[PDB]
Amino acid sequence: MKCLVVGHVVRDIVKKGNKVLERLGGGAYYSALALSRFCDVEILTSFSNLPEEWIKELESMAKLQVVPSETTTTYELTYLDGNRRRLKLLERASPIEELPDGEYDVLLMNPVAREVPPALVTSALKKFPFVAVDIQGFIRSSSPGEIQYQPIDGSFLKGVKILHADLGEYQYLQGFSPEFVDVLLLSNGPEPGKAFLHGREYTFEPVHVGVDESTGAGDVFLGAFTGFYSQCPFVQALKRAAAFTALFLKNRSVDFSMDDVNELAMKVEVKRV
Ligand SMILES: Nc1ncnc2c1ncn2[C@@H]1O[C@H](COP(=O)(O)OP(=O)(O)O)[C@@H](O)[C@H]1O
Numbered sequence: 001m002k003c004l005v006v007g008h009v010v011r012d013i014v015k016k017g018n019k020v021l022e023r024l025g026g027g028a029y030y031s032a033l034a035l036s037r038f039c040d041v042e043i044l045t046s047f048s049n050l051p052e053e054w055i056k057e058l059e060s061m062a063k064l065q066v067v068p069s070e071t072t073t074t075y076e077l078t079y080l081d082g083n084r085r086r087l088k089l090l091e092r093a094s095p096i097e098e099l100p101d102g103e104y105d106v107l108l109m110n111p112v113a114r115e116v117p118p119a120l121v122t123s124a125l126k127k128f129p130f131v132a133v134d135i136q137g138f139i140r141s142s143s144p145g146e147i148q149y150q151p152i153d154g155s156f157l158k159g160v161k162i163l164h165a166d167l168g169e170y171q172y173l174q175g176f177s178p179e180f181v182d183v184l185l186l187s188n189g190p191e192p193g194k195a196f197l198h199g200r201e202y203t204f205e206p207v208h209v210g211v212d213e214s215t216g217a218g219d220v221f222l223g224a225f226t227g228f229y230s231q232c233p234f235v236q237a238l239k240r241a242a243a244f245t246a247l248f249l250k251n252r253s254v255d256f257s258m259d260d261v262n263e264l265a266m267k268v269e270v271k272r273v
């Protein structure tokens with residue numbers, strides 16, 4: 001397979017206690033990282049400058065298509081536990097307005113700062129047969145600071161194959177019922193999550209891991225699920241996505257074997273109804 005992941009790569013300023021570091025982040029990066037274990041990935045993104053080593057990391061995992069920009073999207077993430085976080089947008093790269101006219105088995109739209117208009121999802125749903133979406137960058141407002149949320153109508157998501165939102169993000173979605181999409185992944189950090197298959201609800205319990213931050217969790221979970229769902233029954237795909245994401249969080253990498261994923265996935269609880 002061949003997939004296109006769309007959205008800004010980010011200069012993350014990660015703060016955990018009194019400690020601060022810069023690293024590569026973004027929905028596009030993290031979702032591509034997950035999908036790189038399943039397929040050839042390309043990333044449609046925008047940025048201005050990034051460190052040579054970060055550009056090498058991206059180009060080792062994916063072909064890059066970069067919309068010119070004079071700015072690079074930059075977020076400060078402050079972690080008070082592993083999941084409870086403050087996000088502050090410091091800088092935003094150029095919007096993404098055009099899709100390539102090549103042919104991909106999967107288009108995954110994962111913006112972080114309103115860089116993908118709803119209109120582009122509608123274009124994508126016509127020019128491509130399989131579209132997956134993370135909602136995060138659609139419900140955030142675009143201006144600098146502590147992030148604000150804006151509700152949106154969900155009707156444009158009809159036809160989306162797989163959609164992911166965490167619990168706090170979901171409440172800003174409206175004109176929306178889960179059956180608008182083939183699979184809704186509704187996650188809640190370390191706590192139990194929900195998955196809907198054609199609107200029928202399942203619950204899942206993630207693998208317990210002790211982490212000082214969870215940056216990229218949702219992106220990896222969406223990316224890995226999209227990969228497993230293409231080659232596993234629904235439930236198994238859910239379990240393997242959870243396990244993969246759990247391995248990513250402690251390894252903060254995707255440099256573990258698929259056999260370990262499959263072993264861990266056996267222990268993930270999933271219930272129907
Ligand atoms: N602290 C954690 N411990 C164990 N698993 C986690 C943790 N945080 C996230 N996960 C896994 O990642 C998935 C998505 O993470 P979540 O934090 O819900 O999304 P987002 O990063 O978009 O907020 C969860 O459903 C869970 O499987």
Ligand SMILES: O=P([O-])([O-])O[C@@H]1[C@@H](O)[C@H](O)[C@@H](O)[C@H](O)[C@@H]1O
Nearest residue numbers: 025026027075215216217218219
């Ligand atoms: O943690 P998560 O929900 O997968 O996604 C995160 C984005 O919401 C955030 O804007 C970005 O700066 C991080 O690098 C990461 O991509």
Ligand SMILES: [Mg+2]
Nearest residue numbers: 136166218219
């Ligand atoms: Mg998220």
